[PDB]
Design a protein around this ligand. Structure first.
Ligand SMILES: NC(=O)C1=CN([C@@H]2O[C@H](COP(=O)(O)OP(=O)(O)OC[C@H]3O[C@@H](n4cnc5c(N)ncnc54)[C@H](OP(=O)(O)O)[C@@H]3O)[C@@H](O)[C@H]2O)C=CC1
Ligand SMILES: CCc1nc(N)nc(N)c1C#CCc1cc(OC)cc(-c2ccncc2)c1
Length: 186
């Protein structure tokens, strides 16, 4: 088990979701960025683990579940078994991380990526240890019903650059955004 990372795309009004969908129209390269960041393992024979909440899970198009090339884990207290397509389910982020140490996952998992939503993000951000936040700042306001918790700038440092990540402004569909990487080690 390697790094603990969160990854999120967030609007200017701190929005991340709207009606079980993204607040903004599809941004192809933001998507490609998400896919390549979450899928790419730094170790041969190992896959990355994606941890998501139930709503995030069901917001993903059925034909794209589970997230290809990655081990999918769903967080929920109501579900009695992993949803169709998933094989792992945990009552909390802490339980999931503890699960990553058991033999069934211990030697198969490289990086751990939290991919939403709000309360998963919260729990992760407040979790102790080396944590990295990959935050796409979408430089525009969008109507949202789900929100990204504010980053404690007394715990986190904003990195000026991160390896493999471009720090310049991106633009698709008339929408400008930027890749940021925050870090804490406690
Ligand atoms: N822009 C972005 O980077 C992303 C956007 N989104 C968007 O956000 C919306 C979904 O996010 P959101 O509304 O926050 O929903 P979530 O994905 O967080 O799902 C909420 C449910 O997940 C379970 N859950 C969540 N957090 C925890 C936790 N910490 N411990 C245990 N269980 C937990 C609970 O289920 P239960 O009731 O069973 O206990 C809860 O009811 C979608 O519209 C999606 O498109 C999502 C991720 C990323
Ligand atoms: C690309 C956004 C995104 N960007 C970033 N920087 N971090 C994130 N955590 C997410 C996210 C998310 C959650 C999410 C929502 C979603 O709504 C239809 C679709 C997918 C998805 C669809 C098809 N293949 C894979 C994933 C994923």
């Amino acid at each position: 088990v390697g790094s603990l990372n969160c990854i999120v795309a967030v609007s200017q009004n701190m929005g991340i979701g709207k009606n079980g969908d993204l607040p903004w129209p599809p941004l192809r390269n933001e998507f490609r960025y998400f896919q390549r960041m979450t899928t790419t393992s730094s170790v041969e024979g190992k896959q990355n683990l994606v941890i998501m909440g139930k709503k995030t899970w069901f917001s993903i198009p059925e034909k794209n579940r589970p997230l290809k090339g990655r081990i999918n884990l769903v967080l929920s207290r109501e579900l009695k078994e992993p949803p169709q397509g998933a094989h792992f389910l945990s009552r909390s982020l802490d339980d999931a991380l503890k699960l990553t140490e058991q033999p069934e996952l211990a030697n198969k998992v490289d990086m751990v990526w939290i991919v939403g939503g709000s309360s998963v993000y919260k729990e992760a951000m407040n979790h102790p240890g080396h944590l990295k936040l990959f935050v796409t700042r979408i430089m525009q306001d969008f109507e949202s019903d789900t929100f990204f918790p504010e980053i404690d700038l007394e715990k986190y440092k904003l990195l000026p650059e991160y390896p493999g990540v471009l720090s310049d402004v991106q633009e698709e569909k008339g929408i400008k955004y930027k890749f940021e990487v925050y870090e804490k080690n406690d």
